[PDB]
Design a protein around this ligand. Structure first.
Ligand SMILES: [K+]
Ligand SMILES: [K+]
Length: 887
């Protein structure tokens, strides 16, 4: 398709030509055309074999979780909120223009809930989502019991050597290791049936109520409402809470008046955000804002008015790399036994990581690509009565030890922190570290923080965090875990990874793999599992230089950590990802081998490159355990790219000619108000980041058959940007030129940006030239000027006598391209703009010529050029030459 589609708002999509003009009548209310009510908006859209596929979701959607009976999750039929999300396939029915017409429609239903899932969901509790305005101090939580307060109790410290063997903690040198963090304060946790508040606390160490629903509505809510009142078209203090209602509206939180709808409705709304199409499937996943606990796998072959069922992430096993890497995640999901009446959590019911913050989803060839962060999910003790971990989340640093052999496989499979706590704070001679030094009796036993005694008489249930952090523990290991600051003291000095905090996840899912996820989703009775083995994990912290004044040699923790983050987030500890796209590399490969492809995704302070073997559509790898999985490469941002507000991400396109990704950011996406209820005024403008591959690419030649280096990428603030204008769209015409449509007032203006040695700058003269289009689809040809089409000077008729061409014939001259090229002088409008003449016998004696001329997009245009089958009628000149012979 030689046209470009452009979402002009929540409902309408319009086709643009490469001249930044709308195709007449192509502007389409797709919501209306999908026969859906006006509460529906477009969430994502895609081209697949020339048809348009659109994901719609409703602002009216309301969802219930009744934790008793069956079919536990369902839409609120009463009022009207049975407004499920739909995927729709449109085709173009005209040959002249764009008339879209609906072909298939798919309702995305609410998940089945096996009896066995529902016991976890009874007591599942979820953190309020991270916003733009959430502070490191907001996220901090009160430090929980030490490893020996839980096991031994209130007797003494100096039993720890004699007493640890009976609690299966042999040789563990960490009685003073945290078992996580208190839920009596901090960010709010809520069950699927309750609601999150609009207030976040500035110091969650002191001002949350945490999971104490009761306490909130009884005590703390009127206090926070006193401190942080909603603007009205009072203004108050903000000593203790931010009011983030508007920043919540911003990331897709839904409301009745000033109250957010229940968690289950926010999970559903946020879970229908991204789509991707194959010949056989539509897959639908969630946004990078909320954790998503399920995805949909629609079979294109599905019947009308059917009910496409989502698959639980809890039912979907990934390869985390090595096997120990997966066990780290599951061991911290909750307490496991076959002694515990009603101690029901994801780990005890034999489920796996239940929640991802999805970066996005795409299809290449016939494969779904995805990436994301593991959303923190752990045990919390929910008992009453006098249980010592009561009201406490059970979490700990799983960060490698210092003495761990350097070499990737050896680092991520180090046994340090596998079964319970060991990390905290240590000093050897006068060298300090948060990480355990070691890793003669036997082994160094880690064990889950539940006193063997009270084992049947404890209540460990599941929680899900709003970020990629397991432990909010207001201690030093927390900051080094999240920021990437645990290093060993050896020859090379190597960064020691977490296998629980800040874990990035990516993969390629095959059609058979999809067919199981659907099979899991329709299973009646018991949970059916699904293996995605084309997948990997990676420790991916936020860059430390997004913070200040951190101490190493009072040691800095989350509650005191100064953020200087420039990427539109107040916090400097939680990582974020957005806009995963794939593309096929257009740079041919040694034949005998299939097109190379990859994907990129932005993360805090860097681009990441996903690498694949197109042979067997797998992840790239190398024989060597030592070196780090070559499926992943991270390239840090420079100051210019770090300045971009990631929370304003709008769109990402690939272009197979350039082999370049364009990330568009639109500042109109900022919330109306700050957490201090101050109006936001830097909401004008936009920014484009350009990504391109680097490194030696697979199968360029005999030597590159294999690789022990990961192909990387590079993000560049391209130079296309504005703080003044309202974006409408960015047409990436070619490697050399981009077109921005925008308003300054209320009428659209076209700017052309030109690529100068890899930096794009506005060409005021090309812009005014392309804009001069007389209300037509394409820019005017102008006889005495060098406008968008350049300037064409025809030879005088007397060039024929001059060059003895009178002796040649129309029919001869027409099959001599290089002779009629000498019938004009072209002055181009941009470097290496080309132009040919096209002849046409008019008589026995005469021909005429009309030029074929390159535009910004690389393509030639002439008198018969069409876009979407609609004649452009560009108005190039013509010329008759006469006095040729008839031999
Ligand atoms: K593996
Ligand atoms: K250039």
């Amino acid at each position: 398709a030689n046209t470009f589609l452009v979402k002009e708002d929540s409902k309408n999509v319009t086709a643009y030509t490469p001249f930044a003009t709308p195709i007449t009548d192509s502007k389409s209310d797709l919501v209306s055309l999908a026969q859906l009510d006006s509460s529906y908006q477009i969430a994502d859209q895609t081209i697949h074999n020339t048809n348009l596929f659109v994901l719609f979701k409703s602002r009216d959607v309301k969802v219930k979780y009744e934790s008793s009976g069956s079919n536990n999750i369902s839409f609120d039929s009463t009022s009207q909120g049975e407004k499920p999300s739909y995927v729709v396939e449109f085709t173009n029915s005209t040959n002249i223009g764009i008339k879209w017409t609906m072909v298939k429609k798919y309702q995305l239903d609410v998940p089945n809930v096996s009896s066995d899932m529902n016991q976890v969901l009874k007591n599942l509790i979820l953190e309020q989502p991270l916003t733009k305005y959430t502070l490191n101090s907001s996220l901090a939580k009160e430090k929980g019991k030490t490893q020996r307060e839980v096991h031994l109790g209130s007797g003494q410290a100096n039993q720890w050597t004699s007493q640890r063997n009976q609690h299966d903690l042999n040789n563990n040198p960490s009685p003073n290791a945290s078992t996580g963090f208190k839920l009596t304060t901090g960010n709010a946790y809520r069950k699927l049936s309750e609601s999150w508040p609009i207030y976040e606390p500035i110091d969650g160490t002191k001002q949350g109520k945490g999971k104490d629903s009761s306490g909130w509505s009884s005590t703390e809510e009127n206090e926070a409402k006193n401190d942080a009142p909603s603007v009205s078209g009072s203004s108050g203090t903000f000593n203790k809470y931010l009011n983030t209602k508007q920043a919540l509206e911003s990331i897709g939180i839904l409301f009745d008046d000033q109250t957010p709808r229940n968690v289950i409705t926010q999970l559903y709304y946020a879970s229908t955000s991204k789509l991707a199409v194959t010949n056989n499937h539509i897959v639908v996943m969630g946004n990078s804002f909320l954790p998503s606990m399920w995805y949909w796998v629609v079979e294109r072959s599905a019947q009308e008015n059917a009910s496409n069922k989502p698959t639980w992430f809890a039912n979907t096993n990934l390869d985390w790399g090595e096997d120990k890497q997966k066990q780290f995640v599951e061991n911290q999901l909750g307490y496991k036994e076959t002694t515990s009446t009603n101690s029901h959590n994801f780990h005890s019911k034999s489920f796996t990581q239940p929640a991802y913050l999805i970066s996005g989803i795409d299809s290449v060839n016939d494969q779904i690509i995805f990436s994301g962060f593991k959303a923190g999910s752990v045990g919390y003790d929910s008992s009453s009565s006098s249980s010592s971990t009561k009201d406490q989340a059970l979490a700990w640093s799983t960060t490698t030890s210092l003495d761990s052999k350097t070499g990737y496989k050896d680092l991520v499979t180090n046994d340090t922190g596998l079964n319970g706590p060991i990390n905290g704070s240590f000093s050897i001679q006068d060298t300090f570290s948060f990480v355990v030094p070691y890793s003669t009796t036997g082994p160094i036993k880690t064990a889950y923080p539940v006193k063997k005694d009270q084992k049947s008489t404890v209540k460990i249930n599941s929680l899900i965090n709003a970020t990629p952090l397991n432990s909010y523990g207001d201690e030093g290991i927390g900051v080094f875990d999240a920021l990437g600051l645990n290093y060993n003291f050896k020859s090379n000095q190597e960064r020691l990874p977490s296998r629980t905090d800040q874990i990035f996840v990516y993969g390629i899912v095959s059609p058979n793999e999809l067919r199981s996820a659907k099979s899991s989703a329709d299973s009646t009775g018991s949970d059916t599992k699904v293996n995605w083995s084309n997948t990997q994990s990676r420790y991916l912290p936020v860059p430390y230089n997004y913070s200040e004044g951190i101490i190493d040699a009072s040691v800095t923790t989350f509650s005191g950590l100064k953020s200087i983050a420039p990427d539109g987030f107040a916090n400097s500890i939680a990582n974020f990802s957005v806009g995963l796209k794939a593309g096929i590399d257009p740079n041919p490969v040694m034949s005998g081998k299939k097109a190379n492809y990859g994907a990129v995704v932005l993360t805090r302070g860097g681009v990441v490159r996903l690498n694949f073997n197109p042979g067997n559509d797998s992840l790239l790898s190398t024989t060597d355990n030592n070196i780090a999985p070559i499926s992943f490469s991270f390239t840090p941002f420079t100051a210019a790219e770090s300045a971009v507000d990631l929370t304003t991400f709008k769109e990402v396109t690939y272009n197979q000619e350039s082999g370049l990704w364009s990330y568009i950011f639109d500042s109109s996406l900022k919330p109306s108000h700050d957490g201090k209820q101050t109006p936001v005024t830097d909401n004008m403008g936009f920014s484009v980041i350009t990504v391109s591959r680097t490194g030696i690419e697979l199968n360029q030649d005999q030597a590159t058959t294999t690789l022990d280096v990961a192909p990387s990428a590079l993000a560049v603030q391209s130079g296309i940007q504005s703080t003044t204008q309202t974006l409408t769209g960015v047409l990436p015409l070619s490697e050399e030129f981009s077109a921005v449509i925008a308003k300054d007032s209320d009428q659209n203006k076209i700017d052309i940006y030109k690529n100068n040695n890899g930096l794009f700058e506005i060409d005021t003269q090309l812009s005014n030239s392309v804009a001069t289009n007389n209300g037509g689809l394409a820019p005017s040809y102008t006889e005495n000027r060098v406008d968008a089409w350049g300037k064409v000077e025809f030879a005088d008729n007397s060039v024929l006598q001059a060059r003895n061409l009178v002796d040649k014939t129309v029919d001869e001259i027409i099959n001599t391209p290089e002779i009629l090229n000498s019938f004009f002088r072209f002055t181009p409008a941009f470097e290496d703009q080309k132009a040919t003449l096209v002849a046409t016998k008019q008589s026995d004696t005469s021909l005429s010529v009309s030029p074929r001329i390159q535009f910004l997009d690389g393509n030639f245009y002439d008198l018969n050029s069409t876009i979407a089958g609609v004649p452009l009628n560009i108005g190039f000149p013509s010329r008759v030459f006469a006095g040729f012979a008839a031999l």
